[PDB]
């Protein structure tokens, strides 16, 4: 549960500016009180003409989006997204993101 | 450079709640225009009874503090904290924190 889900910024309305993030960190303190997420967002709001190098995209229910690894921030349990969907198939994205953005694999 | 510095807050006023952060992330985007930081804070205002799990305290000239790894958020270069001091000697803290909390090693 507290990990790998497609967590959309608590309030789906948040998506206007911020739609989601992904639970990826404290396996223990994953969603206990907060988690290290890579805030996903609509590629459209940030120009569909985006380059390829950082912040991976997905193809979820709401369509395509982009892991905002350029910011990264813990999204407290309160606002721990209102389960809109789940992108486990993109599990690597969550990792690679971190793994490159946070480590540079 | 953009990493092992004791970045307080472009506006030291923030320190009331949030005084610092520690540039620690992008090896490539290290000083591009942003860095993933562990928002440091005053052990005092944040309870002197802080745990020894992730929250890495510091003892620098400006005084003792604690990298708030409970959140961790990349502060854009602009507002990347007004250089208050520097804690490279705590470089590992910055790493281990990340490395355990963000990777676990």
Give phi and psi for A68, each to the nearest 5: -80, 75
Q: How far does CA A87 lie from the centroid of its chain? A: 9
Are residues A77 and A32 in contact, defined by beta-carbon separation less than 8 angstroms? yes
Would the CB atoms of A36 and B70 count as touching at under 8 Å?
Answer: no
Residue of A nearest to B25 (CA): A102
Q: What is the 3-state secondary structure (H, E, C) of chain B?
A: CCCCCEECCCCHHHHHCCCCEEECCCCCCCCCCEEEECCCCCCCCCCCCCCCCCCCEEEECCEEEECCCCCCEEEEHHHCCCCCECCHHHHHHHHHHHHHHHHCC
Chain B residues with CB under 8 Å of A70 CB are 29, 34, 74
- The CATH T-level fold of domain A1-105 is SH3 type barrels. (2.30.30)
Chain B residues with CB under 8 Å of A73 CB are 71-74
d(CA A76, CA A78): 5
Quick check: A34 contacting B, CB < 8 Å? yes
Are residues A4 and A21 in contact, defined by beta-carbon separation less than 8 angstroms? no
In order of A40, A44, B23, B27, the CA distances from B50 in angstroms are 32, 43, 22, 30
Chain A residues with CB under 8 Å of B36 CB are 72, 101-102
Quick check: A45 contacting B, CB < 8 Å? no
Quick check: A36 contacting B, CB < 8 Å? yes
Give phi and psi for A92, each to the nearest 5: -60, -45
d(CA A27, CA A61): 26
Would the CB atoms of A34 and B72 count as touching at under 8 Å?
Answer: no
In order of B55, B60, B89, the CA distances from B85 in angstroms are 19, 8, 12
Would the CB atoms of A36 and B98 count as touching at under 8 Å?
Answer: no
Give the closest residue to A77 by CA, choosing from A29, A45, A44.
A29
Chain A residues with CB under 8 Å of B70 CB are 33-34, 74
């Amino acid at each position: 549960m507290s990990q790998f889900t497609l967590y959309k910024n608590k309030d789906k309305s948040s998506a206007k500016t911020y739609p989601y993030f992904v639970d990826v960190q404290s396996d223990l303190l994953d969603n206990l009180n907060t988690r290290l997420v890579i805030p996903l967002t609509p590629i459209e709001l940030l120009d569909k003409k985006a380059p390829s190098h950082l912040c991976p995209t997905i193809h979820i229910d709401e369509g395509d989006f982009i892991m905002l690894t350029q910011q990264m921030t813990s999204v407290p349990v309160k606002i721990l997204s209102e389960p809109v969907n789940e992108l486990s198939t993109f599990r690597n994205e969550i990792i690679a993101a971190i793994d490159f953005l946070i480590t540079g694999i």
